Amino acid sequence: SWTDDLKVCNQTGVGEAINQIYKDDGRRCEGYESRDKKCLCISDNNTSLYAILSGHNGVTVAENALQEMAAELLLGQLNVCNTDEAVKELIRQSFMSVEKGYFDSINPHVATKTAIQLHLSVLQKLDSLNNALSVGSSAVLALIHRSHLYLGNIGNCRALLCKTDEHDTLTVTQLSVDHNLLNAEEAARLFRLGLMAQNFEGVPLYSTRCIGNYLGKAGYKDCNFLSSATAEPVIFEPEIVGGIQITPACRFLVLMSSGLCRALHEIFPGDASTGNRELVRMISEEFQNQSTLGGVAQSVVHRIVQAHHDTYMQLVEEHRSVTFNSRDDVTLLIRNFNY
């Protein structure tokens, strides 16, 4: 619609750090293209959207997905549905047809791959290029519709609500569901497909659900390394939580992109929720120290990314294990109810 234009939320602060490849040398290689796509859109007095879409191996899908979901639920298909169930169904449908749109788009691309692969059983290399149908996107979108918070996510991106309770202080509570190996249920799903952890060595933080990525869906076989599986590994089944009544007790909402989750887990060690607490310490220390909302967000991001490169550099300093060696686009969104 392009979201880029839609009115901006003065109650939301943004932090961004651009993807990096860390050189052993010491130097780095920042990208140009961000693969993270954001929205902090006010459609109307009641309706507003906060979303991060993390593009994988490409920006095409994340771009297209944000534009389409804004279009499917912003102008303004929301006043026709009362019940929380109907609003949930609205967002559920919005994902469904973002995926429908993907598979209509790549339709010929696969028919081109199979066409050239059929003539095998002078350039040839463009066959690798042709496996550009590995492009897809994680997504997290919080939709505040008139004192009610709705949350639809798929893949790596994450959503946190910070509540203060009966003797305080700050209770972090993840509304998102991680669709990757940080989530045992997902590990067990893969286990059951005939996959093992060793199949995912060297592959950063593979989301086990996402928009698009034909290569991990139908024709996962043309993975090497998705190829042992006995059924499609990457399923399309987003998670939708409905009608969280934003109360005076609800303090602020935190949206995390894929890059950000990856980074946190690489520096914080284990258990995919210690990372959260340390992100929300980190910010709660920042709103005693800063005043501008986008400044708080940019300071916290800026800490982590160098906390990340220190962890890398303090790994190359000691016995050079070196698990990670890069950074994806880090993005942080803080929607604030109570300063």
Rounded CA separation 136/311 (Å): 29
Q: How far is CA 162 from CA 174, 245, 252, 283, in A?
A: 9, 13, 6, 11
Per the entry, the structure determination technique was X-ray
* CA–CA distance, 335 with 255 (Å, rounded to integer): 8
Residue 21, φ and ψ in degrees, nearest 5: -105, 120
d(CA 100, CA 49): 22
Output phi, psi for 165, to 5 deg.
-115, -145
Residue 71 structure tokens:
């279009």
How many CB atoms within 10 Å of residue 258?
A: 32
Adjacent-strand bridge partners of 54:
36, 138
CA distance 213 to 219: 10
Q: What angle do CA 270, 272, 276 make, to 5 degrees?
A: 115
CA distance 271 to 7: 38
Do the beta carbons of residue 15 and residue 332 sit within 8 Å?
yes
Number of neighbours of residue 272 by Cβ within 10 angstroms: 18
* Contact between residue 206 and residue 233 where contact means Cβ atoms under 8 Å apart: no
Query: Resolution, rounded to a tenth of an Å?
Result: 3.0
Output helix, strand, coil percentages for the chain, rounded to the nearest 5.
35, 25, 40
Map residue 26 onto helix, strand or coil.
coil
Q: What is the residue type of 291?
A: S
- What number of H helices and E strands is found in the chain? 9, 14
| Domains along the sequence of the chain with CATH | 1-339 (3.60.40.10)
Number of neighbouring beta carbons within 10 Å of residue 333: 27
